[PDB]
Amino acid sequence: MIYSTVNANPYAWPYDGSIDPAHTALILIDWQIDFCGPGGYVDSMGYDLSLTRSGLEPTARVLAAARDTGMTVIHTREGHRPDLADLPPNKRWRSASAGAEIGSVGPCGRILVRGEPGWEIVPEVAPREGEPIIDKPGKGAFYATDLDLLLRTRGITHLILTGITTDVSVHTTMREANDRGYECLILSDCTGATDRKHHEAALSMVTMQGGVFGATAHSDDLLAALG
Amino acid sequence: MIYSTVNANPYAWPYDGSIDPAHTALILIDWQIDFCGPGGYVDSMGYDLSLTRSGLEPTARVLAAARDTGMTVIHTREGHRPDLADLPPNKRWRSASAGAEIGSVGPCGRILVRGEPGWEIVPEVAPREGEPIIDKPGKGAFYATDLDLLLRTRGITHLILTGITTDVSVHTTMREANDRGYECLILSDCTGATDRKHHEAALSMVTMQGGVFGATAHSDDLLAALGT
Amino acid sequence: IYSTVNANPYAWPYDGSIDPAHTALILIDWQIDFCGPGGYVDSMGYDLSLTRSGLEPTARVLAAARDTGMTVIHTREGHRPDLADLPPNKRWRSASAGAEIGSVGPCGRILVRGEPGWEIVPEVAPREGEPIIDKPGKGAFYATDLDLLLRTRGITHLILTGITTDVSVHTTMREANDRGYECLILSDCTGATDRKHHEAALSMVTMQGGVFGATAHSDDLLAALG
Amino acid sequence: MIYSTVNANPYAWPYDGSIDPAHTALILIDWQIDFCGPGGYVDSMGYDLSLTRSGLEPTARVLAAARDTGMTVIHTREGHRPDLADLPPNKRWRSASAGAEIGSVGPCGRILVRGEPGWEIVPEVAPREGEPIIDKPGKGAFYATDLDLLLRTRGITHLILTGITTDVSVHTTMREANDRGYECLILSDCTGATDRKHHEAALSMVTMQGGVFGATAHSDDLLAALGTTV
């Protein structure tokens, strides 16, 4: 009912020496076809989907352990209002430049638009009632959302991060959370990027200055702490 | 005077195809002894200061052009209130773990405390009157500050980013800006990290997906586009 | 580009004209929960005629904003059906006033997203291209994307309608003003649970040369728009 | 250690049945010459300083009770960077319209500029070390400040509000706090406005809907509760 530290890089996580489920949230970031599925945004830009998809089954196991421990669980979906009123023109222009324009029709509907097949959370990690979903127009889950209000009213102080991609939406969310004083763990095997060297360097960045953004861990080490 | 695009990775920056100094700000991030000087935070943790100091002279040249062209200039200092009311305990404990506890007395005073010698902006990139200084308790310049009010008040839409470190305060500040729709350039030779691989990987991360966080460039290509 | 409005206490806006391309009409919380029988405000026993008098004037201002092509944004106060965005003090006060957020009344669960009492009333129904803000608080900025929507469209100027004058409208004006938005509040397109609070909310705006912006009757805006 | 509720309007404050100093902050809002002093912004606009000053003596006594019980104490100053980079032009234009332009030289230096005599907290409620000061460029204490960071790192859940003016900075701070889930008390005698009717109407707005922004009380009712541990 109170858990020990996780074997983590570069310190035994978290810093206060124990994980309380009543103050800990598992975050699942952007597990959507647009980031890890055929026909979606990342696929249409020519990136290797095996680099993102490897995180899925490890994440499913960590989601069951969080449900079993009564951790809070929060899901994120990167996406835009169908009218695109939350889409900066630079973001739109780059997506067109990369051959996968946000709001344009691809094999999985309108790219990164809320309500579209490619925007949905994949079945492997489907949310259930009582696990709030953040709909974010940005990479960072804090910006232009109610996330911080959801975390503060639940008294959350500790975040465990899974999702995609490691260097983009996961790292942005970790950095925003860290600046607010949240104690964050990132799971090396439940994340993935458009480039394996970016995945590795993003985990590596976390570990400097005695853990500038938190700690990294394998899901095996978290499942071990959770019993 | 408006200027054409910078030769950048992965697109000719900015996306809208001109640089207007009325709408552009040069950001100098955390050029402090604590991040690039003997006796400070980063030195005390045992990292190599030459990795952070190489960006100083190139930054001073970009600062000269930015003041030349009439674009706004904004400076940042990472630091805490002397009473540490703005210091999360996890940030404090990790700094102790690394051998350089925030608030502890080092060779340049209380480490990362506002008012202390190690927290001062180094003279090579000293601020002038009318160039606002951001005091931030975090790595991101937008969290717990007035930066967004300063930028919206001057009508800024475009940021040129310099300072340290590439993968920590610079990247966080770039990520925060980018999500609000600021168009951002990061200068490869005017930034630096506690690790060369982290600096290089931080620059490259920007360039993916057609420029997910904006674009990278050498100060040479910025100074060419400005006609300096 | 349109002329200034005959406003209190200066000719609004401060920069001397209204550009539809930089102006948004905001319609705040026109929901059965705030102005309709069977909703939150009715359940607390407040007088609905105080809130409902602003409706037909708002409809008229909504038509003039649509005709001039300015941005239109609507707000709905409401909570996630799981109530993860509901502070315990807000819930507790609502229970205390005999209309608990989430409790079932004639119009479904009070102040819950998806429920009949939460919907925007038809007299000011939104149309395509008019973004709706879903807010868990009185202020339209807190825990929403409102500021992203406005900044992306280049909005500098807000015209404020909706209910109530002293709660959600005043909070939203105070938030927008502090960010440097130039705000007009329409006296006849707002209403409160108390006439004195309505009038006092409006005069608070007019102090110190217009501390939060300016007040106007919809007639004065429509005269400016014509 | 833990204290009884306050006899407040419209419920015995706070909603969770007791006051814990470990989780409660006293906030002192904008007790500056520019709002309550001769030669300052409000004086230069022609408003009656007796309306703001009356709150000063009861505030000193509440400040004393807060420091005695070991509550957190936070002070705010409304003000602008000397370069005016945080000053929206509509704010400046209204101040010039009202005959007291922000940044302009008056009897107490540059009006509402940080570092100037008019801007200083007045000596009756001077901060001590360990009581953070918030420098805000707006009326609300949360916008473009670290206040939320200070409050959350200290585990503060409950606010007691004093300061000026009741209808501007104090109300705006209260609305911001309340929306984020903070439980707030506004002290009727430790606040004041440019208009008595605005002060009274600012306090009764709080009381509607079972206490839409929190509750109101007299310093006497607060001081009674702080003499009654449970």
Author numbering:
A (entry chain B): 1 to 227
B (entry chain C): 1 to 228
C (entry chain A): 2 to 227
D (entry chain D): 1 to 230
Show sentences the authors wrote.
Biuret hydrolase (BiuH) hydrolyzes biuret to allophanate and is part of the Isochorismatase-like hydrolase (IHL) protein family within the cysteine hydrolase superfamily. TrtA is a member of the isochorismatase-like hydrolase (IHL) protein family, similarly to BiuH, and has a catalytic efficiency (kcat/KM) of 6 x 105 M−1s−1, a KM for triuret of 20 μM, and exquisite substrate specificity. TrtA and BiuH are members of the IHL protein family that possess the catalytic triad comprised of a cysteine, aspartate, and lysine residue. Interestingly, the active sites of TrtA and BiuH are almost identical in sequence, and so it was hypothesized that triuret is the substrate for TrtA, funneling into biuret metabolism.
